[PDB]
Amino acid sequence: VAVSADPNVPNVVVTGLTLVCSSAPGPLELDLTGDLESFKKQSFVLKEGVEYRIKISFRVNREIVSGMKYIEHTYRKGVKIDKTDYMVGSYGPRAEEYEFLTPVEEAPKGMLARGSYSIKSRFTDDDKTDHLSWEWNLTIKKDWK
């Protein structure tokens, strides 16, 4: 009953990001329990105009977390061109992982919209806790290729 060692398992473990896209020829998942820096040297390719949702896979292990929020600030050629907040909600503990889907979004289209992007994601809550922060890239092209 008096524990000699701490379990060290965070109450909230953000496990993954996935772009749910029917048109995509291959996988589009970020294993967030792994190495996060390597994501900056890779990218997700999305054909212009295609619809997709962003699935944030997380585990709420022990306590109820209120007002969960998933924030994305997107960058193009070094400068921030977008800021989007998504309301995830209040989640109680569970053995089974949670999968939060954002509303249907579209990949941008046009000459001025194609190119390389860089998203700085933050999964947070009411007490503004940093459950996880990571950077991933999205390259918008004419075709999947």
Curated annotation (Swiss-Prot):
Query: What subcellular locations does the record give?
Result: Cytoplasm
Residues found modified as N6-succinyllysine: K83
Main subcellular localization, coarse class? Answer: cytoplasm
Describe its assembly: Monomer. Interacts with FER. Interacts with PLXNB3. Forms a heterodimer with RAC1. Interacts with RHOA, the affinity is increased by three orders of magnitude when RHOA is prenylated. Interacts with PSMD10; the interaction increases ARHGDIA association with RHOA, leading to ARHGDIA-mediated inactivation of RHOA and ROCK and prolonged AKT activation. Interacts with KANK2; the interaction is direct and may regulate the interaction of ARHGDIA with RHOA, RAC1 and CDC42. Interacts with RHOC. Interacts with CDC42. Interacts with NGFR (via death domain); NGFR binding decreases the affinity for RHOA.
Q: Name one GO molecular function term.
A: GTPase activator activity
Q: Which UniProt keywords apply?
A: Acetylation, Cytoplasm, Disease variant, GTPase activation, Isopeptide bond, Phosphoprotein, Ubl conjugation
Q: What is the protein name given in its UniProt record? A: Rho GDP-dissociation inhibitor 1
N6-acetyllysine found at: K47, K69, K83, K120
Family membership: Belongs to the Rho GDI family.
Biological role: Controls Rho proteins homeostasis. Regulates the GDP/GTP exchange reaction of the Rho proteins by inhibiting the dissociation of GDP from them, and the subsequent binding of GTP to them. Retains Rho proteins such as CDC42, RAC1 and RHOA in an inactive cytosolic pool, regulating their stability and protecting them from degradation. Actively involved in the recycling and distribution of activated Rho GTPases in the cell, mediates extraction from membranes of both inactive and activated molecules due its exceptionally high affinity for prenylated forms.
GO BP term, pick one? Rho protein signal transduction
CC per GO annotation: cytoskeleton; cytosol; extracellular exosome; immunological synapse; membrane; nucleus; Schaffer collateral - CA1 synapse
Question: Which disorder is it associated with?
Answer: Nephrotic syndrome 8: A form of nephrotic syndrome, a renal disease clinically characterized by progressive renal failure, severe proteinuria, hypoalbuminemia, hyperlipidemia and edema. Kidney biopsies show diffuse mesangial sclerosis, with small glomeruli, hypercellularity, increased extracellular matrix, and contracted/collapsed glomerular tufts surrounded by immature or abnormal podocytes.
Residues included from the entire protein: 59 to 203 of 204
Cross-link Glycyl lysine isopeptide (Lys-Gly) (interchain with G-Cter in SUMO1), sequence positions: K80, K83
Cross-link Glycyl lysine isopeptide (Lys-Gly) (interchain with G-Cter in SUMO2) maps to: K80, K83
